[PDB]
Amino acid sequence: TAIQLKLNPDGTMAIDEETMVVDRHKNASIENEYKEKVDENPFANLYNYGSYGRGSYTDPWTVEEM
Amino acid sequence: FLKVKGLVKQHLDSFNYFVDTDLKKIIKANQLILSDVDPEFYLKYVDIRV
DNA sequence: AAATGTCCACGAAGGGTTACTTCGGCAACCGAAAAAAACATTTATTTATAGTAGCCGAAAATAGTG
DNA sequence: CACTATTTTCGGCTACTATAAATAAATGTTTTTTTCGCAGGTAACCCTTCGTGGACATTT
RNA sequence: GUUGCC
Fold first, then answer.
1. Contact A24/B39, CB-based, under 8 Å?
2. How large is the C-alpha radius of gyration of chain B?
């Protein structure tokens, strides 16, 4: 995303005024288009006391590990 | 003329034009609020109902 | 000499500038920004409880198909 | 009538949850101070400039 | 304080 110029027959060695600035959203919109779309069911978001608290499920130990 | 088109003609037939058609033409003119910080976040409005 | 060259001040004309437009009565109703400072939490480690709560999960069990 | 087929359910296993108490260290969050924000309606009436003529001055 | 009306 460096600056780009071109060579006109009228004015040679002229630099593009639109490449001087960057949009900072076209790059973000490419990946956001290529994300999965899902329809939110307001029942799915349910939350309890076991929410937003660190700690997870430990994978139980095997005798090969012992 | 007054049976189907009454006495309050100017007051109701403008508000009935507002709620059905005139609201979609406003969300389509102020859509896609953006944040320059964290540029991949966008809220856009698809329709509006009352 | 004297006539013209010049310089000077009062007045003329218009220039934009500033306080102006009843008398009653009833209802009401309403700067920001860096720095300095203080101080709680997270950071462990116990070591005793019961409760959620999650994830599993296997095995108890009624049920679904041939 | 019977081995399935997924389910129902316990079930034990684990992971936090206040509790007091030590640092020592680091972090993260918020008042209290000390301190400069860029062009590079009508009518007097007083106000200003235009104009015009005043006498000194200096040349002829 | 602000509007409405006679």
1. yes
2. 18
User: Considering only CA atoms, which of B22, B18, B50 is closest in space to residue B10?
Assistant: B18
Q: Is the Cβ–Cβ distance between B50 and B27 less than 8 Å?
A: no
DSSP for A15-62 reads E-TTTTS--SSHHHHHHHHTS------TTTT---SSSS-S--PPPPP-
Work out if A47's Cβ lies within 7 angstroms of strand C: no
Q: How far is the CA of A64 from the C1' of C56 (A)?
A: 20
φ/ψ of B41, rounded to 5, equals -120, 125
Neighbours of B27 (CB within 10 A): 13
Instruction: Tell me the resolution in Å.
Output: 4.3
Method: cryo-EM
- Work out the minimum CA distance from B30 to partner chain A, whole angstroms: 18
Q: Which two tokens stand for residue A15?
A: 């630099």
Residue of A nearest to B34 (CA): A25
